[PDB]
């Protein structure tokens, strides 16, 4: 009840922003809208949770301090510190059930809830551990995030598969119509392990990465995943389910390969999409010798047609696709040329960067 600390604003701002950002989603449970503050030894720990995931930040206390703990409204405390001027010294002390914040001639009195009432952390043990650059995790998530299901009745699809095996880390996401897979080497021999990170967890893991030189350290348990970057520790529950065996649906023997410029292909699909059915978004692809024709029609009987020069020397074919699924892939590919691998008009197509096998995308066609 006698916690005291003084911290410079810029050493407190990012911790508060990171731990407080995800909070406020459980309005019937007031204490989950608060941050747990703990002063012990020379460290201030800041914890916020929604019971599904948790964010912890450590702040070094260089100025005199006194041990203690409390909980305070997260966003208000963040807004106060961010509203103070650059360079401000933020003196905090507990006085009964009020937390007092002083800086210059700005004084604030916040309401508290006892630290003893804060949900005590999930106790779990790590089963797999590895380190990798932040940029590599950045790439793995961006390459597949868009293919995750949104509010699918199949809860096990509303997340991202994280797969470790040998020297490879792999992410997979699918909604049953389209699939994205991305693999990166990490340089450690790892045991074979597959876990599903919930959608919200993926986003939060995404947003704590600053690309900087700090490495990322991942610990995977049986029911939780943890990411440690610098002075931040993020923990999330795993989705307790089984991801589909995606290897079975990867096109087995695509004998027809098409290559085209990524941008020209994307700008052509994007124009044709304008006159596609606004709900079903169907477009038609006609592939012939070194030529791709894209058409679109809508209930108003309006029509678009695009003809592109491509590299294709296979059987003539027609195949329908949801143009949004196609455009999402081309937007996710940040490359010069793309390769499309086809089988027939009723089978999926595999799309990739022509110059890299790192990421692959499988899109199921439409019956147009």
């Amino acid at each position: 009840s006698h916690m005291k600390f003084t911290v410079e604003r810029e050493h407190l701002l990012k911790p508060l922003q990171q731990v407080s950002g995800p909070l406020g989603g459980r309005p019937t449970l007031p204490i989950l809208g608060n941050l747990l503050l703990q002063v012990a030894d020379g460290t201030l720990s800041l914890t916020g949770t929604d019971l599904e995931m948790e964010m912890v930040a450590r702040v070094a206390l260089v100025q005199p301090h006194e041990p203690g703990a409390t909980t305070v409204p997260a966003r208000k405390f963040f807004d106060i510190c961010r509203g103070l001027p650059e360079g401000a010294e933020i003196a905090v002390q507990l006085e009964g059930e009020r937390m007092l914040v002083r800086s210059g001639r700005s004084r604030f009195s916040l309401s508290t809830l006892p630290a003893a009432d804060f949900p005590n952390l999930d106790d779990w043990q790590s089963e797999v551990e590895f380190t990798l650059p932040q940029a590599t995790m950045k790439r793995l998530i961006e390459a597949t995030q868009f293919s995750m299901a949104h509010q699918d009745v199949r809860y096990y699809l509303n997340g991202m598969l994280f797969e470790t095996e040998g020297e490879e880390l792999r992410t997979v996401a699918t909604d049953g119509h389209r699939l994205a897979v991305c693999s990166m080497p990490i340089g450690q021999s790892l045991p074979s392990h597959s876990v599903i990170v919930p959608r919200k967890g993926v986003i939060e893991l995404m947003r704590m990465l600053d690309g900087g030189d700090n490495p990322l350290r991942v610990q995977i348990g049986s029911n939780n995943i943890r990411a440690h970057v610098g002075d931040f520790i993020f923990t999330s529950k795993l989705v307790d389910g089984r991801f589909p065996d995606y290897r079975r649906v990867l096109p087995k023997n695509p004998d027809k390969h098409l290559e085209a410029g990524c941008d020209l292909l994307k700008q052509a699909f994007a124009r044709a999409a304008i006159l596609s059915n606004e709900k079903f978004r169907g477009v038609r692809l006609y592939v012939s010798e070194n030529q791709l024709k894209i058409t679109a029609n809508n209930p108003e009987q309006e029509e678009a047609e695009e003809i592109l020069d491509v590299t294709y020397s296979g059987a003539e074919m027609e195949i329908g696709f949801n143009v949004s699924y196609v455009l999402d892939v081309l937007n996710a590919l940040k490359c010069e040329n793309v390769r499309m691998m086809l089988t027939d008009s009723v089978s999926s197509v595999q799309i990739e960067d022509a110059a890299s096998q790192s990421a692959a995308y499988v899109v199921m066609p439409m019956r147009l």
Partner: peptide, 5 residues
Amino acid sequence: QAXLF
């Protein structure tokens, strides 16, 4: 739309 499975 056709499905992957």
